Amino acid sequence: SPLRVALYGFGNQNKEMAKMLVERKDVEIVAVISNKSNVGKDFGEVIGLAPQGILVTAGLDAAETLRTTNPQIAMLSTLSTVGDIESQLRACAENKVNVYTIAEELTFSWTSAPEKTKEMDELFKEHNVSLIGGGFLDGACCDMARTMAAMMHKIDKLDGGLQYNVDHYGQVLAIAHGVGLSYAENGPGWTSPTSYPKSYVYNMNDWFASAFGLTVIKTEEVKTPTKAPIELYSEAIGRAIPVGQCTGMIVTATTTTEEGVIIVEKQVGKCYEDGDEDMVFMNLEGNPTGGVGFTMKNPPTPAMTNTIAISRMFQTVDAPAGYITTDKLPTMEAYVHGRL
Amino acid sequence: HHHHSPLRVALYGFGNQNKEMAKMLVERKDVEIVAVISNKSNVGKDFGEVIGLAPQGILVTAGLDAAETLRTTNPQIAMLSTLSTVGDIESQLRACAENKVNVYTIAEELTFSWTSAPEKTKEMDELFKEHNVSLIGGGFLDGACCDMARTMAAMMHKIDKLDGGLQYNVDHYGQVLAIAHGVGLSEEEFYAENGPGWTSPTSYPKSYVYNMNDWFASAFGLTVIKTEEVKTPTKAPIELYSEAIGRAIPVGQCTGMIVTATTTTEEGVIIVEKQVGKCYEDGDEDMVFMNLEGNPTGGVGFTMKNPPTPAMTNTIAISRMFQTVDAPAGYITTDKLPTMEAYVHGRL
Numbered sequence: 001s002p003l004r005v006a007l008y009g010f011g012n013q014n015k016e017m018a019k020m021l022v023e024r025k026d027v028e029i030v031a032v033i034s035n036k037s038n039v040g041k042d043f044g045e046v047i048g049l050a051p052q053g054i055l056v057t058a059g060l061d062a063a064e065t066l067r068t069t070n071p072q073i074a075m076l077s078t079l080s081t082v083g084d085i086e087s088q089l090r091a092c093a094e095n096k097v098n099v100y101t102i103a104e105e106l107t108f109s110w111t112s113a114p115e116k117t118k119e120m121d122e123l124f125k126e127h128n129v130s131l132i133g134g135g136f137l138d139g140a141c142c143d144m145a146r147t148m149a150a151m152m153h154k155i156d157k158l159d160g161g162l163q164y165n166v167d168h169y170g171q172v173l174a175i176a177h178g179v180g181l182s183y184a185e186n187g188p189g190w191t192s193p194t195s196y197p198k199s200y201v202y203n204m205n206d207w208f209a210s211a212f213g214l215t216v217i218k219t220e221e222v223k224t225p226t227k228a229p230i231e232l233y234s235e236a237i238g239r240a241i242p243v244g245q246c247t248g249m250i251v252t253a254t255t256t257t258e259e260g261v262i263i264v265e266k267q268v269g270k271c272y273e274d275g276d277e278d279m280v281f282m283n284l285e286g287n288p289t290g291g292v293g294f295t296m297k298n299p300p301t302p303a304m305t306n307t308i309a310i311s312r313m314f315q316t317v318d319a320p321a322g323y324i325t326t327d328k329l330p331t332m333e334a335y336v337h338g339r340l
Numbered sequence: 341h342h343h344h345s346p347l348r349v350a351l352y353g354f355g356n357q358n359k360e361m362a363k364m365l366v367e368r369k370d371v372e373i374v375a376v377i378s379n380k381s382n383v384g385k386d387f388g389e390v391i392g393l394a395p396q397g398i399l400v401t402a403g404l405d406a407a408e409t410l411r412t413t414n415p416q417i418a419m420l421s422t423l424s425t426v427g428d429i430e431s432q433l434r435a436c437a438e439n440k441v442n443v444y445t446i447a448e449e450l451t452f453s454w455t456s457a458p459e460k461t462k463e464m465d466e467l468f469k470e471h472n473v474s475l476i477g478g479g480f481l482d483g484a485c486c487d488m489a490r491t492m493a494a495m496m497h498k499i500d501k502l503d504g505g506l507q508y509n510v511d512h513y514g515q516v517l518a519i520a521h522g523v524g525l526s527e528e529e530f531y532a533e534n535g536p537g538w539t540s541p542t543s544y545p546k547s548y549v550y551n552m553n554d555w556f557a558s559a560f561g562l563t564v565i566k567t568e569e570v571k572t573p574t575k576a577p578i579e580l581y582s583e584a585i586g587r588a589i590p591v592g593q594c595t596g597m598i599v600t601a602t603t604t605t606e607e608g609v610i611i612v613e614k615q616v617g618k619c620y621e622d623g624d625e626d627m628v629f630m631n632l633e634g635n636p637t638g639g640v641g642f643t644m645k646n647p648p649t650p651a652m653t654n655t656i657a658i659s660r661m662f663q664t665v666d667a668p669a670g671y672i673t674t675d676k677l678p679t680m681e682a683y684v685h686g687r688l
């Protein structure tokens with residue numbers, strides 16, 4: 001019988017994920033949960049398809065829907081933090097439903113959220129199911145670099161990066177980045193060892209430290225404004241940015257290690273001049289010397305987030321019970337013809 | 341984790357690649373070098389002294405005596421870094437197989453030799469099967485090209501086209517390899533009968549990209565209709581100097597060669613790979629690129645700029661040692677292996 005799959009959340013990501021999972025003949029969508037949006041309608045009609053024979057169910061009824069529909073996995077595409085997804089995780093664990101989530105933090109949440117991660121580990125262990133996640137950060141950043149790093153004899157430094165256009169993420173995300181502003185205490189740009197939530201690059205640094213078998217001393221984030229040598233216009237905050245005014249934000253996560261290996265990753269959200277593009281880069285310094293690195297220009301991150309998730313489904317079902325970080329998994333399941 | 345005896349490793353060949361591979365394997369505490377074979381070069385000297393190191397207690401042995409050396413030294417694997425073709429390495433493969441020694445080779449063709457050399461590959465498969473050992477290879481083409489793309493391709497829902505590429509400086513590969521890529525030829529000389537540009541259904545050996553195409557077709561579970569190669573000379577808008585042929589290359593004279601391998605498939609998937617070997621002008625760099633077209637639609641690709649390919653060839657090989665020993669007997673293409681063994685601190 002095909003894998004029984006729930007879509008937990010049905011916004012931008014799981015709408016697109018649904019189109020692909022409908023085509024997959026090794027999968028059967030058994031449930032699609034939203035909060036309030038589209039809640040009476042057939043999920044296929046929502047996304048421009050023929051009726052599928054399954055209705056979008058409500059957030060409040062999640063636990064009952066997961067009990068009666070008997071999914072082996074829920075694709076949790078709701079929120080970013082172990083705290084904010086806790087309620088959805090609990091509904092899954094209590095009904096013996098495995099989870100792959102695209103929640104950024106769950107790339108590696110052990111140090112950013114120690115107690116909430118421990119709780120979710122123990123809960124999934126108790127009901128004998130697995131929690132895994134990270135989406136784009138899991139597959140396109142960490143797993144790509146894990147393959148590349150096999151070709152290193154000695155790593156002294158991992159120097160990695162993620163660049164996105166923050167003007168295309170709405171207000172709220174623009175406000176959380178220094179767009180419009182100019183290091184004050186109540187401005188993001190102030191940071192401390194206790195500040196929460198941590199950046200995506202914080203969780204990626206800990207993923208690498210785990211994969212490379214390193215011992216973390218400290219991961220510190222340093223938040224720095226971006227500027228342009230010319231006047232920009234922001235269509236996010238609706239104002240010109242004069243020269244020397246903040247256009248966006250870099251979070252640089254620096255991990256020091258008892259082995260002397262340095263891990264530096266930059267998260268860059270800014271408005272973009274001529275020539276700026278969305279980017280992933282990973283570079284390894286050591287031996288081989290002079291830099292072993294890859295770049296991805298203009299990655300279709302939204303679609304790739306969903307396919308990474310799809311590549312982890314059977315692995316998540318088959319993983320040991322508990323919170324399993326992706327460094328403990330094999331590579332994303334290989335592309336093969338004949339699944340559609 | 342209980343102690344395992346160190347892997348017993350032979351270096352079969354001892355030129356540019358295995359000299360550098362030796363320096364790294366000496367540092368690896370999970371490995372014991374048990375033999376280093378050359379043809380004639382350095383035969384009789386201690387392999388450590390050859391490569392600027394303290395005496396290791398192992399002398400460089402001769403090509404003709406390979407079978408005896410592999411019999412008395414009892415290696416579990418031979419790192420075969422000699423020649424490029426399943427035909428030309430046959431005699432070294434036979435020495436290994438008959439002494440139950442597994443092989444990882446950097447022989448370009450053994451990325452995927454099944455269609456470029458059907459009968460010789462079948463023979464080597466059956467020989468390794470009979471002696472219950474594994475033949476695996478491809479070096480830089482295996483790990484940095486095919487395996488990197490295999491990870492990236494997991495992120496595809498549907499692949500319509502793979503568009504891939506490899507660029508290297510042939511002026512740094514000696515006179516013979518420069519001549520094989522047509523450096524210093526006029527275009528007309530380039531396209532003369534059995535010149536570098538000449539191409540036919542009977543042409544042999546095939547390009548590296550030919551074998552990579554078939555690796556992808558195997559990995560993606562596709563059925564090959566035809567792979568054709570098309571050869572094109574490279575030119576430069578200014579005069580270059582070639583160290584390899586030791587003279588100026590006038591404007592419009594061939595600076596090297598592009599081999600484009602195009603594979604069609606019963607599934608409608610197209611696989612196109614370019615091999616570019618030429619003399620560089622200012623701003624030319626060594627490159628790998630792989631791009632996947634389909635769904636996701638917006639272009640799923642990576643580029644590697646300025647890879648240290650010689651050292652990466654060796655580390656790829658090192659990442660395959662335990663896998664090769666562990667693999668089922670026979671000729672095992674790397675699409676049937678897991679990813680290159682992950683980097684982990686504390687092996688040195």
Ligand SMILES: NC(=O)c1ccc[n+]([C@@H]2O[C@H](COP(=O)([O-])OP(=O)(O)OC[C@H]3O[C@@H](n4cnc5c(N)ncnc54)[C@H](OP(=O)(O)O)[C@@H]3O)[C@@H](O)[C@H]2O)c1
Binds near residue numbers: 014102104
């Ligand atoms: N890993 C990556 O690189 C990556 C990339 C893309 C997205 N993400 C993250 O993934 C998350 C989802 O993104 P998206 O674009 O799909 O978001 P979205 O469009 O905001 O969709 C959220 C969906 O989840 C539902 N939801 C929220 N809270 C819920 C709850 N308690 N119970 C049930 N359903 C609930 C929403 O219902 P309503 O419509 O009724 O609110 C909606 O259906 C975000 O946190 C985003 O940052 C990660």
Ligand SMILES: NC(=O)c1ccc[n+]([C@@H]2O[C@H](COP(=O)([O-])OP(=O)(O)OC[C@H]3O[C@@H](n4cnc5c(N)ncnc54)[C@H](OP(=O)(O)O)[C@@H]3O)[C@@H](O)[C@H]2O)c1
Binds near residue numbers: 402422431481
């Ligand atoms: N897959 C990849 O990415 C990749 C990359 C680089 C190289 N390669 C290939 O690897 C091969 C070797 O490369 P290289 O740069 O190390 O070459 P090299 O400097 O020519 O060394 C080759 C070694 O093999 C020895 N040898 C040759 N035939 C032998 C035989 N029958 N028995 C024993 N030893 C033998 C040679 O001995 P003598 O010095 O005494 O003649 C030499 O020690 C070539 O085919 C090259 O094209 C592949």
